[PDB]
Symmetry: none
Subunit: 216 residues, 2 copies
């Protein structure tokens, strides 16, 4: 064998509710009563949320439930609260001290209000410079959905060269963070009037400009 069987998705809006299927066979689900359910957030470790058919750990939200019907076990998400955008997983014992898992389910919930990104620009710093080094960082955060562009403006003019823009990571919110840097020399940073970070998210353009004029 190899698998249990799950749907790739599960769209349930705030309240509206969700429910997952876990199906294997008699040999595992129908035989035995040991469907488990683990959740893994984008590149995170599992929390064990259900074990022994419908029992929950000490610190599993009240609204995660489960069911089973012969071969068709199931997770129920009592009225979605968006935080729970994850990857779910089922699993069942097959005796011989071996367990086999579900293919997984991404649960994308809509009705999360849309957020515009708290953009911060940074100055290099005293130390960073004591070494003859100058990175500027543009910190883009707490936006949803996770689509931004990040431009830099060497004075009123564009710059590509020394950019490196990460791709947005989910926070503890369906809010993202997407940090881009420009890495120049002191001789680059002082041979210049200003430097501006431009972050176009979903129609809204935000631009922050670091003028050398500040402290250390």
């Amino acid at each position: 064998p190899s698998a249990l069987t799950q749907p790739p998705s599960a769209s349930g809006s705030l309240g509206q509710s969700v429910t997952i299927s876990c199906t294997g066979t008699s040999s595992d689900v129908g035989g035995y009563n040991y469907v488990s359910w683990y959740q893994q957030h984008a590149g995170k470790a599992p929390k064990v949320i259900i074990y022994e058919v419908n029992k929950r750990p000490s610190g599993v939200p009240d609204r995660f439930s489960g069911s089973k019907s012969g071969n068709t076990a199931s997770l129920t998400v009592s009225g979605l609260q968006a935080e729970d955008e994850a990857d779910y997983y089922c699993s069942s014992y097959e005796g011989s001290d071996n367990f086999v898992f579900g293919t997984g389910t991404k649960v994308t919930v809509l009705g999360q209000p849309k957020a515009n990104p708290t953009v911060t620009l940074f100055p290099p710093s005293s130390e960073e410079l004591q070494a003859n080094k100058a990175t500027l960082v543009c910190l883009i955060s707490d936006f949803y959905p996770g689509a931004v562009t990040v431009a830099w403006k060497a004075d009123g003019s564009p710059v590509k060269a020394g950019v490196e823009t990460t791709k947005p990571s989910k926070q503890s919110n369906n809010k993202y963070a997407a940090s881009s840097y420009l890495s120049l020399t002191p001789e680059q940073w002082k041979s210049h009037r200003s430097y501006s970070c431009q972050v176009t998210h979903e129609g809204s353009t935000v631009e922050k400009t670091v003028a050398p004029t500040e402290c250390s």
Copy 2:
């Protein structure tokens, strides 16, 4: 209890022998010989590769070895194969509703020369302070394999609350970058000697401090 400490990155070449550790919160383990090691690929099946500290299941190579004698689980991939790239996890069963996962090691087959990260910590900008905002950022770049652990400390003690980290994005030079941040009140900021960001990569660690000043 919730945490079993697993490295950030375990790297080897084809035929080399990678060793992955799982140490954990001490007040347990020893009269606890139920530690299981899991395996998963690019969103493709979170299999169990070891159970009961040393026991392989069926359809698993003896290339995977397991040990706990000590107070640390060690999974040894002896003779590194290609398809062995994955995010390894250990776990351990407490009470019937306590199933704690390890932080989980991404295992790479070094596809480049290794890059220990460059930690560059920024203090709160002059202006952000002028806004009554306190963002101190930890920029992490030019690393490979793209696995890090990031802690924050304030004056000795770890800063748990207010932390948020990015996902290690691929960059042009074929190294990677990430970023953390912490969000304070100006007060929070100034009532403290130093804030350090310390980032672990394999078994190189950097720890970089940022002390508050008046700027003005």
